[PDB]
Amino acid sequence: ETMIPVLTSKKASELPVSEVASILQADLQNGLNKCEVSHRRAFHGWNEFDISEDEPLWKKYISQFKNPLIMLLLASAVISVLMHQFDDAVSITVAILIVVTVAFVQEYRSEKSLEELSKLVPPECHCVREGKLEHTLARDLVPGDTVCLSVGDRVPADLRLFEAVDLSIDESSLTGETTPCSKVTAPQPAATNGDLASRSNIAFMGTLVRCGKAKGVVIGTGENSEFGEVFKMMQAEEAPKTPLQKSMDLLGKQLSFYSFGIIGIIMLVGWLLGKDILEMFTISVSLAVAAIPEGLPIVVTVTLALGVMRMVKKRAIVKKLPIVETLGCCNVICSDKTGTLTKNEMTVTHIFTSDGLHAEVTGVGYNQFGEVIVDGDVVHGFYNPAVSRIVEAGCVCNDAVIRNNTLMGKPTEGALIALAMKMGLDGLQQDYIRKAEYPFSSEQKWMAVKCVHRTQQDRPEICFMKGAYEQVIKYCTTYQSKGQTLTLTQQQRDVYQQEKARMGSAGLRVLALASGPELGQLTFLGLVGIIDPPRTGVKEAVTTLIASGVSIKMITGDSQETAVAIASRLGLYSKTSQSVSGEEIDAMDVQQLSQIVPKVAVFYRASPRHKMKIIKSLQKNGSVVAMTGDGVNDAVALKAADIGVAMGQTGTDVCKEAADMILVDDDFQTIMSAIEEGKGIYNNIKNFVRFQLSTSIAALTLISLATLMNFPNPLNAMQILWINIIMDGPPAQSLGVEPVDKDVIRKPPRNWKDSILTKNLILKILVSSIIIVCGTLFVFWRELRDNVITPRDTTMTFTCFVFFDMFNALSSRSQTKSVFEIGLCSNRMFCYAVLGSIMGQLLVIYFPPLQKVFQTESLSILDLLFLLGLTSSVCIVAEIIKKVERSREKIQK
Ligand code: ALF
Ligand SMILES: [Mg+2]
């Protein structure tokens, strides 16, 4: 009954090699035979990730067709086509097709193609079976198999390491940092096994081996591992619906319910009085056509696409419309430190000498830009012997070479090379000829070279060593103070240890340097502080974002000290900020987690599950978080969040393909510009949505009043479709691209639970609809003769409705600002739209085939003057209301 239990990474880490092998029934030397691996694979399945399949585009088209409004429109179309009204039916189906095409384009998936996650997995693996090392695919691996790891070989599964010599594994897939973690074979205590990064005896799937060789026993395959859990979380997580999308859905369902109730009561009251079935069906089709605003989604999609292109011009790639729209009104921003805040380039910032001098080094990156200051004085070359000796020791004893701003070697060594180059000592290494080399190993933690001067070979040999302070100070016997060589005392070691501890508490990496004639008689020069500094201009941008309405959080993969130091540098750890680890996050209840999340801003040692839990807790109380990252765990976090902001030209492909916006030439001012553009687009969307809703309900209630008060249909489906789609479009697009005011880009972001329709907005909409209905009814009653539909009456009604809609759009162009301050032809797009609408109306009135199609007569100059003068009535009362509310605001101020 061979039944292997699932050995977690923690439990395997605690268990020594013998018990792990006994539980897994795995032979460390001879490996597994084919029968046992076949049976285990038959039980545990394959070591493969199933990406599954998506749904075809036609299913999405059908689902978009499944809207209740689309059913109502299709019912109206089928009723029209069943009544020998093929022209009206054709127009209705054309409008329906356009509407669903626009909706599908707007709601089209951004082509995630999330198979990049299943590519940081080796296709082959060097496994040992039946005492023979065989080249097999990783998909054939099973728990209990023995896998040999080499340099450049990607870890194919979770392995319990039992043999390892100087094994450094790149773990930038679960931690997200390119710091090779040393791997050991001894079991780990349960006290330090809280974090994944502390598991030095476990080789995780998807990680790359940088140096050394090792052999491990598989403890997990496929979906029962760390990478498997990450894949499960990514696959089972979908992008939440944006607050804009939720508001649009609520408005649509409310409109559908209202229209259904209205048409039901209209049918009931018509049947109570008694009407012909043909006329009842025609009236029902009329209200069905007038109930659905067809141009609103088209205008929304067009204006959002225009904003997306404008931000693309502003160096911001956008793939989906509503997600960036809700990002424009985001509340919380979470960003990774290693890959987004810091540029992932170790730089020396603090230098401490044996004499006791403290030196601060400016500049970021592997470039000569930057100065070394001591007591406020810039030191160049060999000006200060104390600092110069440390720089020389770090420079000659260095295997790293920096070419055209790209580092080849260890990042800490590159930091020393950059520090030397900033001081003008970039060519010092060529001046010395190395005779003996002692390398940097995880067992020794120190690097030394024996070199003699190139032009002064007859000078005695000088030895330079760098490494950890504890190991370096052993070989140190003397120290230099003010040019004099003094013997090392215990007090000197004490103060050096205190300085090292102080530097370590500030998130700096402590490296010791020493020099002397022979090993064991070396002289200690001092210590250097190496940290990952933030990018340039990042602090000012973060301050600008946090100044108005944004509370920026922080998720960090390093320990508490580095996160605290980075937050203090940015300003997120001033005096009272707290740091919470992932184990604490998973410890308390979700209610306590939601209580503790908003009052903290620093997170250290966070797994992908920890980031997902933090994002869910932030979104639980109601907020629009903006997660930012560049790693696989970061990518999972962005997938969990509604909006995903990635890092361009410096992040992984998985994060780029799993995000929403790609930030080439990574800036935060671009994020601010995107937020301002989103706010302006939301304001314009509200404006033209209000205009379209007012027009739609005005037409609906006008038709209802005409039906109740017993006149025939004034407008058919074709007239309403022509008004809504062809001519009401460009004005709404111009309103969508209306220039923004100085008060829109400012002010804290709005709460996400609000609705587009407000009390004042709906009151103005109702007033405008009532005015339009009264005008249209008066015109129809005046131009009606013996209950006979005259082509002149139809033309007058059409022109009056067109003019009223145009003037309503003009009045709804802006709120609480009138048209005098903004001025006519401010953007000239509204002027072009008005001119086009006027030309189209004139063509409809005068062109003979258009007259025959629309059943309209020819108008005179007097009729045009009458219709122009009567139309401006709504504008006067609109400006009166605007002045009234302006006066109310003035007296309230
Ligand atoms: F790069 Al990280 F948490 F520091 F994903
Ligand atoms: Mg990162």
Q: How far, in Å, is the centroid of ligand 2 from the Cα of 637?
A: 11
Verify whether residue 88 is a known catalytic residue. Answer: no
Residues 6+ apart with CB under 8 A from 382: 388
Please check if 169 is assigned to a binding site: no
Domain boundary among 650, 666, 682: 666
Q: Please tell me whether residues 420 and 506 are part of one structural domain.
A: yes
Q: Please tell me whether residues 734 and 882 are part of one structural domain.
A: yes
- Ligand 1, residue 632: give the atom nearest the CA: 5
Residue 216 carries which side chain, given as an amino acid letter?
G
Rounded to an integer, what distance in angstroms lies between the CA atom of residue 366 and that of residue 108? 43
- Establish if 59 belongs to a structural domain: no
- Establish if 353 belongs to a structural domain: no
Ligand 1 environment, Cβ below 6 A: 176-177, 336-339, 555-557, 629, 631, 633-634
Q: How far, in Å, is the centroid of ligand 2 from the Cα of 555?
A: 10
Q: Please tell me whether residues 228 and 265 are part of one structural domain.
A: no
Domain boundary among 644, 666, 688: 666
Rounded to an integer, what distance in angstroms lies between the CA atom of residue 863 and that of residue 859? 6
Q: Please tell me whether residues 180 and 33 are part of one structural domain.
A: yes
Residues 6+ apart with CB under 8 A from 616: 640
Please check if 140 is assigned to a binding site: no
Domain boundary among 666, 689, 710: 666
Rounded to an integer, what distance in angstroms lies between the CA atom of residue 259 and that of residue 267? 12
For residue 510, list its beta bridge partners: 529
- DSSP assigned state of 789: -
Rounded to an integer, what distance in angstroms lies between the CA atom of residue 566 and that of residue 572? 8
Residues 6+ apart with CB under 8 A from 491: none
Sign for the CA dihedral angle at 707, 772, 816, 890 comes to: negative
CA nearest ligand 1 atom 1, residue: 176
Q: How far, in Å, is the centroid of ligand 2 from the Cα of 553?
A: 15
- Establish if 595 belongs to a structural domain: yes
Half-sphere exposure at residue 125, Cβ-oriented, CA atoms within 13 angstroms: 31
Residue matched to tokens 């009251």: 269
Closest CA relative to residue 80, chosen from 721, 702, 659: 721
For residue 147, list its beta bridge partners: 127, 216
Half-sphere exposure at residue 16, Cβ-oriented, CA atoms within 13 angstroms: 1
The alpha carbon of 346 is separated from its chain's Cα centroid by a whole number of angstroms, namely 26
Closest CA relative to residue 690, chosen from 741, 738, 756, 775: 756
- Residue 424 Rama label (left phi>0; alpha psi -120 to 50; beta): left
Greatest extent of the chain over all pairs of C-alpha atoms, in Å = 125
Q: Please tell me whether residues 469 and 560 are part of one structural domain.
A: no
Identify which ligand lies nearest to the alpha carbon of 195.
1
Residue matched to tokens 């033209």: 688
For residue 446, list its beta bridge partners: 467
Identify which ligand lies nearest to the alpha carbon of 647.
2
3-state DSSP call for residue 177? coil
Whether 798 contacts 843, CB under 8 Å: no
For residue 662, list its beta bridge partners: 317
3-state DSSP call for residue 45? coil
For residue 372, list its beta bridge partners: 361
Q: Please tell me whether residues 401 and 512 are part of one structural domain.
A: yes
Q: Please tell me whether residues 719 and 843 are part of one structural domain.
A: yes
For residue 782, what is the domain's CATH number? 1.20.1110.10
Q: Please tell me whether residues 627 and 699 are part of one structural domain.
A: no
Closest CA relative to residue 729, chosen from 298, 107, 96, 291: 298
Closest CA relative to residue 439, chosen from 467, 415, 419: 467
Q: Please tell me whether residues 877 and 751 are part of one structural domain.
A: yes
- Establish if 2 belongs to a structural domain: no
For residue 407, what is the domain's CATH number? 3.40.1110.10
Instruction: Determine the angle formed by the axes of helices 791-811 and 829-846, rounding to 10 degrees.
Output: 180
| Termini Cα distance of the chain | 83
- Establish if 349 belongs to a structural domain: no
Q: Which domain holds residue 332?
A: 327-342+535-666
Residues 6+ apart with CB under 8 A from 667: 315, 537, 541
- Establish if 736 belongs to a structural domain: yes
Whether 162 contacts 28, CB under 8 Å: yes
The alpha carbon of 331 is separated from its chain's Cα centroid by a whole number of angstroms, namely 13
Identify which ligand lies nearest to the alpha carbon of 340.
2
- Establish if 321 belongs to a structural domain: no
For residue 467, list its beta bridge partners: 446, 512
Rounded to an integer, what distance in angstroms lies between the CA atom of residue 500 and that of residue 530? 12
Closest CA relative to residue 340, chosen from 636, 635, 646, 607: 646
Rounded to an integer, what distance in angstroms lies between the CA atom of residue 67 and that of residue 248? 13
3-state DSSP call for residue 784? coil
Residue 586 carries which side chain, given as an amino acid letter?
D
Please check if 294 is assigned to a binding site: yes
Residue matched to tokens 């990478």: 227
Q: Please tell me whether residues 763 and 846 are part of one structural domain.
A: yes
Q: Please tell me whether residues 662 and 544 are part of one structural domain.
A: yes
From residue 649, alpha-carbon distances to 333, 514, 652, 653, 655 in Å are: 21, 39, 9, 10, 11
Overall number of domains in the chain: 4
Mutate which of 335, 336, 666 for ligand 1? The one with the most ligand atoms within 8 Å of its CB, which is 336
Sign for the CA dihedral angle at 794, 799, 801, 802 comes to: positive
Rounded to an integer, what distance in angstroms lies between the CA atom of residue 61 and that of residue 413? 57
Residue matched to tokens 């829109």: 744
Per annotation, catalytic residue among 88, 195, 336, 558:
336
Helical H runs in 709-790?
717-721, 729-736, 759-782
- DSSP assigned state of 788: B
Q: Please tell me whether residues 266 and 331 are part of one structural domain.
A: no
- DSSP assigned state of 241: P
Rounded to an integer, what distance in angstroms lies between the CA atom of residue 209 and that of residue 412? 19
For residue 193, what is the domain's CATH number? 2.70.150.10
- Establish if 356 belongs to a structural domain: no
Whether 245 contacts 322, CB under 8 Å: yes
Rounded to an integer, what distance in angstroms lies between the CA atom of residue 81 and that of residue 846? 29
Rg (CA), the chain: 36
Token couple for 88: 């009206």
Rounded to an integer, what distance in angstroms lies between the CA atom of residue 792 and that of residue 866? 14
Instruction: Determine the angle formed by the axes of helices 669-708 and 759-782, rounding to 10 degrees.
Output: 40
User: What is the DSSP pairing of strand 625-628 with strand 406-408?
Assistant: unpaired
